[PDB]
């Protein structure tokens, strides 16, 4: 009689289904814009946060989700009816969140609790929370849920391609971004997330459309062998979005292909004009 919580940051990008669900539970992550501290969906819309990065001083700064915040919900879930508790959250990589939670998961009387590394954000971690939710509604246990989540965790990354390199070398999230930065100024990198959860440089190519065609090669090869959901994301870029999605529609490429945006917390690090091509298995 497993009854199951599902945690998530805002960072995830969910769909209308897994947003509806009773047992989901999101923190939220604060942008603060040259002082002034908002929450995208409280506060600040996506389309604001964009003409309000455009207009800023400096350039935004995301906090991680409340550690506070968890442990809130969690002290309530025993007493919720809850048994388990599983939390998906952006990667180590790329914020501190995940490394400093993990004391958590033996402080809860009553309560199984597993913080997977899920080594990914945006919309491959939204996916991994709406599985979660199929896999529990199909009969899966415990312990059936964590094995296909690691399954889904080992073949999922994602392709970025970005419009000014500033917001992920100052904010400090392309790995050794200040020390390489001089050298990627006149070609269009593919960055990717590597087998740490970590955003480095993929591929430097020369030009921004053999950069396009190199993307769609490259997610052709690394789905080739199953069934995976493709995803093309933007941030503030939709025309090159539905150029993208229509290649991989004319060449057949994925299992699934879909469309997403980043908001404040992503569009942050990215930067407007920001694409990328996430891919996860179908499980
Ligand atoms: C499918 C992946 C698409 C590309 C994702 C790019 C992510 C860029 C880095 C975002 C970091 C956000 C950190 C928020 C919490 C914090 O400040 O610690």
Known sequence: PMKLAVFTDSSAYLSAETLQREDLFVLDIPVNIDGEEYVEGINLSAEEFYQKMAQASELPKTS????????????????????????????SGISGFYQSIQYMVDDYEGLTIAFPDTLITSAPLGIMVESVFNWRDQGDDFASIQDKLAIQISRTSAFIMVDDLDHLVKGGRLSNGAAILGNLLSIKPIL??????????????????????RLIEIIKETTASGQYRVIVIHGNAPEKAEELRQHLLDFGLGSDVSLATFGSVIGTHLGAGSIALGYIPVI
């Open 64 to 91: 991680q989700p409340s550690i506070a915040k968890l442990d809130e919900i969690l002290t309530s879930l025993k007493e919720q009816g809850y048994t388990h508790a599983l939390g998906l959250f952006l990667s």
């Open 192 to 213: 990717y997330f590597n087998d740490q959860g970590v955003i480095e440089v993929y591929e430097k190519v020369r030009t921004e459309k053999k950069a396009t065609k």
